[PDB]
Amino acid sequence: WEQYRDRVNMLQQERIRDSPLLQAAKENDLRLLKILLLNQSCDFQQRGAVGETALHVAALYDNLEAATLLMEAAPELAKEPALCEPFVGQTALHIAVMNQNLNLVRALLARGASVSARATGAAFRRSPHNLIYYGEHPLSFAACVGSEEIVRLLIEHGADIRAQDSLGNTVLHILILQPNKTFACQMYNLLLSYDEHQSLELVPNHQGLTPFKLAGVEGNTVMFQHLMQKRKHVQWTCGPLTSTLYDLTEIDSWGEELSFLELVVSSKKREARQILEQTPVKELVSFKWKKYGRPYFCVLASLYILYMICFTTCCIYRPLKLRDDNRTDPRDITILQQKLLQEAYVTHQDNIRLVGELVTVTGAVIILLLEIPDIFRVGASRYFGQTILGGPFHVIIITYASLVLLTMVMRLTNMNGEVVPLSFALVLGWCSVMYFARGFQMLGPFTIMIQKMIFGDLMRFCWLMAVVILGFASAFHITFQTEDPNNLGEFSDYPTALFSTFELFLTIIDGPANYSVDLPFMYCITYAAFAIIATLLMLNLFIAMMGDTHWRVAQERDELWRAQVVATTVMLERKMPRFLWPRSGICGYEYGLGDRWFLRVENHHD
Amino acid sequence: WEQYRDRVNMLQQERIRDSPLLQAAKENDLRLLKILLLNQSCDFQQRGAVGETALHVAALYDNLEAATLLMEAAPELAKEPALCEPFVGQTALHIAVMNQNLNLVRALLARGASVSARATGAAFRRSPHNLIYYGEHPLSFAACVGSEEIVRLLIEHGADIRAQDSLGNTVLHILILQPNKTFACQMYNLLLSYDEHQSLELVPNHQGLTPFKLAGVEGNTVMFQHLMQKRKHVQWTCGPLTSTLYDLTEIDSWGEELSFLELVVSSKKREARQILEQTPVKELVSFKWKKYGRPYFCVLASLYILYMICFTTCCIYRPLKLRDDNRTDPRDITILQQKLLQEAYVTHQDNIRLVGELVTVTGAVIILLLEIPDIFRVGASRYFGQTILGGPFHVIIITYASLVLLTMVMRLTNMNGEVVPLSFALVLGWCSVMYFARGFQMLGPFTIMIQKMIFGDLMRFCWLMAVVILGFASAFHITFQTEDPNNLGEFSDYPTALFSTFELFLTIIDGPANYSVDLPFMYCITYAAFAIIATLLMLNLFIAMMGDTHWRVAQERDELWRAQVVATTVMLERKMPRFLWPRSGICGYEYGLGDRWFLRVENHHD
């Protein structure tokens, strides 16, 4: 992209330098402008590399005199935009409003330039290539640069408020998408003042988001607290304490297929979860979590724990018979094998294991029925990537259910090797019990912190560890390759030496030392080297690195846990039936407020 | 609670909106007030949902003109309060004084509203549900809002000083219970100036607390140093150093059944221990600890240590005989059994063990005689919950004494299994030696720090640990369920596999590796997974988590240790006899100061 944009800018400057009218409109050299604009033979419709006119060049460098003599020479240049690929619909109005000068915009609207021109180029799209996103209209441009007089001039010269760009964003959507939020709050106030002449606060874009929902997703909290000034009503104020009444129509979103809180918690932005700490939202999600979220989550946690005890008990009592084949061979310790299906269920305890395994299989089926439409409904990268929603826990529960169904397939068809999917299934299901740790303050941030160092320091330590494992595994294997394996069998072969020095990295098993024989002298030297640079240096520096990372990431995980119980509450509200979750808030139709639901907040000041 | 309070507020606003007189008194629409108050047919005694009148609505929204025309129409509305459940006795005076306007309070006292009205509703009680606690009287309301002219106006219109609410709190009690302490000290000075016309600084509430004792329990130190301005006398000032004389009548509390320092150290508030760092109290408790508390605590510590040596020596030399039953069975290593009671005491060394066990039993009896009335005197949740008083040490002392008495029961009646209560008794008694570590600066904060890590990170690590223990215990048990237990017996059965992977989590015993046999290939994979995510990840992140928590909690344990020796001193002063602890301070009757005891403090300034 960047080479193409650089070539576009250098070609634009080259055709500015080549054309003398464009070059003099750039430098505001007035006498040569009077000579060339006096000449009839000079073509005034000549274009640059992107197709910009001389009026575009005069508006680009804030040359008011050059521009006003160009429209005295040719007013029709106020109508023509650029016509190439990066600036598909950029007029002189866009550059004049962006450059923020009143006289050029006044003269351009005096000559009759079209206000509803859409700058549909690739440089005006909401792209991470582009530095800014100001929209496609001069109305959105005047809102984004923050000029009050230019946007009032555009309103009195036209500029219909309900104008949407290629993404369907209105002017309030783009104003929410800007930085410097307090400087855009008065712009939102002025455009809401001009909106009164259906409402534009309730119309969506092509993504389906209202400006309230876009303020929730983008996470700009100053704009959210400005938008809830119109959705609240102070009931009374007594002494230091007031009671006010927030509206839950735009926040709870009962009848909508996509709710506000779901779009806040399933958002890619870092600052979206701060919307959950705002004064109409935090008490609502705390009420929802304390009344219905926490007991239903504890019931589901205890049910999954009892299901894990059932699955573990069925794995312990698995059908095994004696080995029919004669061993007649050293190093072999297996004495039992898997029973066939015709002999697996012959007794009463086998029938108890049968109904327990049926409970296990039916449980894995209802897990897949709960989780597969959640995979298909929202984006799968967002479903497995957000730690607020519980992505790694989701993929290990999918893997556990797939391994249980693979076990059911290999139990129906008698093939050996069932112990390996029972092993990953037991490990993954019990590690997936930890999804329910987010409902507790004692267990929640610790579980977030251990997943953040699953994806953090442990991967770089496994790379820089397996480097040392390969090198010292090769050295330990070759220094005992000429020796007897019956006297020191830690490094007899190369996978054994690899696993052995993996255990000796972590100081799990002892260093191999047979004091009744003479070990090679090279083994002591390379083991002194391995003991210094790996067990003493690298392991304890891994401890120091997670100790350094803990206090840096502690604020993030503490502010992400209280964003995690909100996503748990939103999941539990839509997955569970409607009769177990009554509608939150206060019914206004009981008190004559007109079929709207409200949240009453009593707070203390002074 | 909160749904009921929200329903009360919405019903109150609904009956405000339904009644036109209440609605116009809310909005201060004066012309419709003149029309309706001109009409004789309009009922002026009509009430809201909580029973408030129109004068209450006019005082709620600071409508002075609406209120004064309502009492020109009906002065008798100044007398009626609300009469429902949340506002049982709220008058218009309470709302007018809370709203802080002089003219409405002046006009309400002109119409004859009763000053001694008690607002005995549930919204005025000292509850965690209520945001404020301002009392029940307009005198206490005027003191709590901090308006001087309103409370002087109430004094000239009545407002007796010795008025107590439903908790027995006077106006000085509620003023101590407020925040913004320096703003309430001037109100305390004003009410103490009006108190001179028995004293209210000496009267208790229903809990039995003076305002001095309530300032100690609540822990507000600015009010404490303001209250000790009247209880101190500067003797002289020479150069940069002054000698002053504090009064120890309200602080030491010799004749009282409940002392001041005991109520400070056995307080649920976090800020109570800062009262122990104040300038009359800190030198007093330092003199009490240095002169009497530390030698008596060291004598008690040495006596308890010698009693542990006696109990340990009696546990080592316990009567054991040879096993009469023939073994005839592998895996059995027991060769000795418990002697019967008729053969336990036949020799001289058995008599030495007998008198040592009598010392042990008599010691456990006198421990129970010291400790059981301490549980029965103060609250048992406060006795076992405060780490300043030593709650966990108290409950393991009760458990140790109960296990010694259970041992005495099983020694008198010859039943096998005495080694298990000797095991918990030895562990709990030696861990209850650590109660005496609080008397030393080197050992005290470390013992508080290990106590807060018992009740902090170890419980969450045990939950997130036992999850991994259950999963990898199940996996390790099933991957060796088909193998010979004689070659690798770490995971032969499921409690053995559970204990084995518990030791493998903490890297205590080595990883099970028999190099003379071929282990299953799945064991190496799941042991590599267990070695990465548990021994490398979770254990060292537990180290990092207590390393992060240590510098956060270090200030708390350092300021809680010097609150712990004060509670030790208060316990040692009342448990021990009176002749070993003489009365602290300086006897004024020797110097003619009139049967009061004083503490002289010489300090340096400039």
User: How far is Cα B44 from Cα A445, in angstroms, rounded to an integer?
Assistant: 59
Whether A97 and A65 have beta carbons less than 8 Å apart is answered as: no
If one counts every other C-beta atom within 10 angstroms of the C-beta of residue A428, the result is 22
User: How far is Cα B287 from Cα B293, in angstroms, rounded to an integer?
Assistant: 9
Smallest CA-to-CA distance from A232 within A186, A164, A283, A190 is with A283
Smallest CA-to-CA distance from A357 within A411, A303, A302 is with A411
Chain B contact for A429 (CB, 8 A cutoff): yes
User: How far is Cα A505 from Cα A530, in angstroms, rounded to an integer?
Assistant: 8
Residues B216, B341, single domain; the answer is no
Chain centroid to Cα A419, Å, comes to 37
Residues B273, B285, single domain; the answer is no
Opening angle at CA B540, ends B534 and B542, nearest 5:
90
Distance from CA of A197 to the nearest CA of B (A): 29
User: How far is Cα B553 from Cα B546, in angstroms, rounded to an integer?
Assistant: 10
User: How far is Cα B568 from Cα B565, in angstroms, rounded to an integer?
Assistant: 5
User: How far is Cα A80 from Cα A134, in angstroms, rounded to an integer?
Assistant: 21
DSSP string, A419-464: HHHHHHHHHHHHHTGGGGGGGSTTTHHHHHHHHHHHTTHHHHHHHH
Whether B135 and B174 have beta carbons less than 8 Å apart is answered as: yes
Q: What is the dihedral of CA B438, B443, B446, B452, to 10 degrees?
A: -30
Question: Is A239 close to B98, i.e. CB distance below 8 A?
Answer: yes
Q: For residue B133, what are the CA distances in angstroms to B59, B69, B141?
A: 20, 32, 9
Whether B70 and B45 have beta carbons less than 8 Å apart is answered as: no
User: How far is Cα A461 from Cα A323, in angstroms, rounded to an integer?
Assistant: 43
Q: Which residues of A are annotated as a binding site?
A: 510
Q: Name the resolution in angstroms.
A: 2.9
Structural domain for A25, as ranges: 1-278+584-606
Chain centroid to Cα B37, Å, comes to 56
Q: Which residue of B has its CA nearest to A315?
A: B478
Opening angle at CA A353, ends A352 and A357, nearest 5:
120
| Residue with the two structure tokens 């029925």 | A369
Residues in chain B: 606
Task: Write down the H helix ranges in A539-602.
Answer: 539-575
Strand partners, B320: B338
Residues 545-574 of B with CB under 8 A from A: 545, 547-548
User: How far is Cα B477 from Cα B451, in angstroms, rounded to an integer?
Assistant: 35
Residues 460-499 of A with CB under 8 A from B: 461-462, 485-486, 489-490, 492, 495-496, 499
Is residue A83 classed exposed, middle or buried when 0-12, 13-18 and 19+ CB atoms within 10 A define those classes?
middle
Q: Which residues of A touch B482 (CB under 8 A)?
A: 320, 334-337, 419
Residues B145, B173, single domain; the answer is yes
Residues A24, A158, single domain; the answer is yes
The total domain count for chain A is 2
**What amino acid occupies position A133?**
Y
If one counts every other C-beta atom within 10 angstroms of the C-beta of residue B76, the result is 13
| Residue with the two structure tokens 């405060």 | B386
Opening angle at CA A166, ends A161 and A167, nearest 5:
90
Question: Is B547 close to A550, i.e. CB distance below 8 A?
Answer: yes
User: How far is Cα B56 from Cα B68, in angstroms, rounded to an integer?
Assistant: 12
Contacts of A78 (CB under 8 A, 6+ apart): A55, A71, A91, A92, A108, A111, A112, A113
User: How does B238-273 read in b/e, with b if 16+ C-beta sit within 10 Å?
Assistant: eeeeeebbbbbbbbbbeeeeebbbbbbbbbeeeebb
Residues A130, A206, single domain; the answer is yes
Q: In what order do the strands lie in the sheet with A232-238?
A: A232-238, A241-247, A597-604, A586-587
User: How far is Cα B83 from Cα B45, in angstroms, rounded to an integer?
Assistant: 13
Q: Which residue of B has its CA nearest to A465?
A: B532
A419, A538, A583, best to mutate vs chain B, most B CBs in 10 Å: A419
Chain A contact for B22 (CB, 8 A cutoff): no
Residue A501 phi/psi, 5° resolution? -75, -15
Q: Which residues of B touch A331 (CB under 8 A)?
A: 516-518
* B6: nearest CB among A499, A539, A600: A600
Q: Which residue of A has its CA nearest to B512?
A: A509
User: How far is Cα B113 from Cα B56, in angstroms, rounded to an integer?
Assistant: 13
Smallest CA-to-CA distance from B563 within B299, B281, B175, B155 is with B281
Q: Which two tokens stand for residue A14?
A: 């080259």
**Ramachandran quadrant class, A318 (left: phi over 0; alpha: psi -120 to 50; beta: rest):** beta
Q: In what order do the strands lie in the sheet with B597-604?
A: B232-238, B241-247, B597-604, B586-587
Question: Is B518 close to A331, i.e. CB distance below 8 A?
Answer: yes
Task: Write down the H helix ranges in A347-390.
Answer: 348-377, 380-385
Residues B417, B526, single domain; the answer is yes
User: How far is Cα A392 from Cα A384, in angstroms, rounded to an integer?
Assistant: 6
Please report the sign of the dihedral spanned by the C-alpha atoms of residue A65, residue A69, residue A72, residue A77.
Answer: negative
User: How far is Cα A261 from Cα A259, in angstroms, rounded to an integer?
Assistant: 6
Whether B74 and B83 have beta carbons less than 8 Å apart is answered as: no
Whether B251 and B547 have beta carbons less than 8 Å apart is answered as: no
Please report the sign of the dihedral spanned by the C-alpha atoms of residue B572, residue B574, residue B577, residue B583.
Answer: positive
User: How far is Cα A442 from Cα A558, in angstroms, rounded to an integer?
Assistant: 11
Smallest CA-to-CA distance from B564 within B472, B479, B439, B430 is with B439
Question: Is B479 close to A423, i.e. CB distance below 8 A?
Answer: yes
Distance from CA of B7 to the nearest CA of A (A): 8
Is residue A222 classed exposed, middle or buried when 0-12, 13-18 and 19+ CB atoms within 10 A define those classes?
middle
Exposure of B265 in the CB half-sphere (CA atoms within 13 A):
29
Is residue A289 classed exposed, middle or buried when 0-12, 13-18 and 19+ CB atoms within 10 A define those classes?
buried
Smallest CA-to-CA distance from B504 within B544, B473, B482 is with B473
Residue A232 phi/psi, 5° resolution? -130, 155
User: How does B134-164 read in b/e, with b if 16+ C-beta sit within 10 Å?
Assistant: bbbbbbbbbbbbbbeebbebbbebebebebb
* B541: nearest CB among A433, A499, A546: A546
Strand partners, B244: B234, B601
Residues A268, A308, single domain; the answer is no
* A238: nearest CB among B99, B471, B533: B99
Q: For residue A117, what are the CA distances in angstroms to A78, A121, A137?
A: 11, 12, 6
Q: For residue A562, what are the CA distances in angstroms to A104, A228, A265, B596?
A: 51, 22, 11, 56
Whether B210 and B202 have beta carbons less than 8 Å apart is answered as: yes
Whether B225 and B275 have beta carbons less than 8 Å apart is answered as: no
Residues A64, A149, single domain; the answer is yes
* A434: nearest CB among B464, B524, B535: B464
User: How far is Cα A511 from Cα A523, in angstroms, rounded to an integer?
Assistant: 11
Residues A452, A518, single domain; the answer is yes
3-state helix, strand, coil in chain A (%, to 5): 60, 5, 35
* A235: nearest CB among B13, B475, B519: B13
Contacts of A211 (CB under 8 A, 6+ apart): A170, A172, A173, A176, A200, A201, A227
Whether B405 and B364 have beta carbons less than 8 Å apart is answered as: yes
Q: Which residue of B has its CA nearest to A502?
A: B528
User: How far is Cα A110 from Cα B490, in angstroms, rounded to an integer?
Assistant: 92
Smallest CA-to-CA distance from B90 within B100, B79, B101 is with B79
DSSP classification of residue B259 = -
Element (H, E) at B38: helix B30-38
Contacts of A546 (CB under 8 A, 6+ apart): A453, A457, B540, B541, B544
If one counts every other C-beta atom within 10 angstroms of the C-beta of residue A381, the result is 10
Residue B345 phi/psi, 5° resolution? -130, 85
DSSP classification of residue B483 = B
H helix and E strand count, chain A? 27, 6
Q: Which residue of B has its CA nearest to A334?
A: B483
Strand partners, A246: A232, A599
Residue B511 phi/psi, 5° resolution? -65, 135
A483, A545, A558, A591, best to mutate vs chain B, most B CBs in 10 Å: A591
**Ramachandran quadrant class, A155 (left: phi over 0; alpha: psi -120 to 50; beta: rest):** alpha
Element (H, E) at A52: none
| Residue with the two structure tokens 């009006």 | B194
Residues A221, A294, single domain; the answer is no
Residues A178, A254, single domain; the answer is yes
Residues B411, B544, single domain; the answer is yes
User: How far is Cα B587 from Cα B291, in angstroms, rounded to an integer?
Assistant: 17
Element (H, E) at B242: strand B241-247
Smallest CA-to-CA distance from B150 within B91, B110, B104 is with B104
Please report the sign of the dihedral spanned by the C-alpha atoms of residue B7, residue B12, residue B18, residue B24.
Answer: negative
Question: Is B464 close to A446, i.e. CB distance below 8 A?
Answer: yes
DSSP string, B266-314: T-S-TTSGGGGGSTTTHHHHHHHIIIIIHHHHHHHHHHHHHHHHHHHHH
Structure determination technique employed: cryo-EM
Smallest CA-to-CA distance from A591 within A581, A604, A580, A600 is with A600
Residues 155-214 of B with CB under 8 A from A: none
Question: Is A337 close to B541, i.e. CB distance below 8 A?
Answer: no
User: How far is Cα B48 from Cα B95, in angstroms, rounded to an integer?
Assistant: 15
User: How far is Cα B560 from Cα B457, in angstroms, rounded to an integer?
Assistant: 19
DSSP string, B518-558: ---HHHHHHHHHHIIIIIIIIHHHHHHHHHHHHHHHHHHHH
